Amino acid sequence: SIPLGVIHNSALQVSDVDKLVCRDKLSSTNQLRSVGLNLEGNGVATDVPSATKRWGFRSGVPPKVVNYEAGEWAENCYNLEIKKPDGSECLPAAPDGIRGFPRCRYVHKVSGTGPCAGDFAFHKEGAFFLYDRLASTVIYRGTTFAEGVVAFLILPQAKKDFFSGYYSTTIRYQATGFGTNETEYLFEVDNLTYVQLESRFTPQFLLQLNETIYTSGKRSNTTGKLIWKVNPEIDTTEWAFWETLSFTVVXXXXXXX
């Protein structure tokens, strides 16, 4: 059966409607809640390379949607525009009334290409893609989401224990070989200026690097594509979010040391 949380002896416990005792009181449907919790909060890697490795294409499984009434503010969300080499769309358009996740500090917008061997993109670990109060088993095109899971609770009737505005920043990425063993990622500074992405790059490091490139004048000043690389010796920040330089030239590759 689907588990149902309840507060007994100053602690959350799993039970269900069948396992309760008469002392437990459900006097209204208001006491029932569904909550979406973000994988972020369990300590998973949130960088684009690590995050995308958790998703994958598969055919024959019909998508499913369940709603949830409350969610968690995310640091990291994702928004995918993936096409095949032939230019056809890899992901379906958002169904009617499926809007993006409502609170994201950083939206990682990945545009790119890959084989996309399957009708729909699922979470390999069984988690959900959280949209605006709707959790889907699949990824929708160009629609912002947080990875997460859903809980159901019977809250108490009254009080349940003993005893900054909203800013969102979009971060753009180019991708090739999406959803394969040899995926390549580039962080986008402008349409001609890019940085080779790595897992260790945090969102704040990317925004700082971007800020430096614009204010040091290290953008492509030609018609051509300029791809910077940061060599291994420059650190960026293994701590979770809630507890926390020169440029030379060699398309056009380059090194930032």
Partner 1 sequence: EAIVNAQPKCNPNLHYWTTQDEGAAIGLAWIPYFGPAAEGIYIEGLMHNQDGLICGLRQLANETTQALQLFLRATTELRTFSILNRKAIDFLLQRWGGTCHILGPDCCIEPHDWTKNITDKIDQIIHDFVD
Ligand X SMILES: *[C@@H]1O[C@H](CO)[C@@H](O)[C@H](O)[C@H]1NC(C)=O
Ligand Y SMILES: *[C@@H]1O[C@H](CO)[C@@H](O[C@@H]2O[C@H](CO)[C@@H](O[C@@H]3O[C@H](CO)[C@@H](O)[C@H](O)[C@@H]3O)[C@H](O)[C@H]2NC(C)=O)[C@H](O)[C@H]1NC(C)=O
Q: Contact residues for ligand Y (CB under 6 A)?
A: 42, 125-127, 149
CB 5 within 8 A of CB 12: yes
| Residue 97 binding result from ligand IBP, ligand Y, a copy of itself, none, given CB thresholds of 5 to 8 Å by partner type | a copy of itself
Q: Does 53 bind partner 1 (CB under 8 A)?
A: no
Go through the chain and tell me how many residues it has.
257
CA dihedral of 207, 209, 210, 216, whole degrees rounded to 10: 140
Q: Does 234 bind partner 1 (CB under 8 A)?
A: no
**Residue whose CB is less far from ligand X, 134 or 171:** 171
Site string for a copy of itself, 215-254 (x = CB under 8 A): ----------------------------------------
**Residue whose CB is less far from partner 1, 61 or 249:** 61
Of 230, 80, 214, 61, the C-alpha closest to 147 is: 80
- 107 CB contacts (<8 Å, ≥6 apart)? 77, 78, 79, 144, 168, 169, 170, 171
Question: What token pair was written down for 190?
Answer: 């402008």
For residue 124, CA distances in Å to 3, 50, 169, 196, 229 come to: 22, 13, 27, 26, 31
Looking at 84, 103, 141, 200, which residue binds partner 1 (CB under 8 A)?
Answer: 103
Q: Does 18 bind a copy of itself (CB under 8 A)?
A: yes
What DSSP state is assigned to residue 225? -
Looking at 35, 45, 150, 227, which residue binds ligand IBP (CB under 6 A)?
Answer: 35
Site string for ligand IBP, 50-89 (x = CB under 6 A): -------------------xx-------------------
**Residue whose CB is less far from partner 1, 154 or 213:** 154
Smallest separation, CB 182 to partner 1 (Å)? 20
Residues in a beta bridge with 193: 190, 226
CA distance 239 to 43: 9
**Furthest-apart CA pair in the chain: how many Å?**
76
CA distance 91 to 118: 10
Residues that bind ligand IBP (CB under 6 A): 12, 33, 35, 69-70, 153, 155, 160
Residues that bind a copy of itself (CB under 8 A): 18, 28, 62, 97, 99
Residues that bind ligand X (CB under 6 A): 169, 171, 181-182, 190-191, 207, 210-211, 214, 217-218, 221, 249
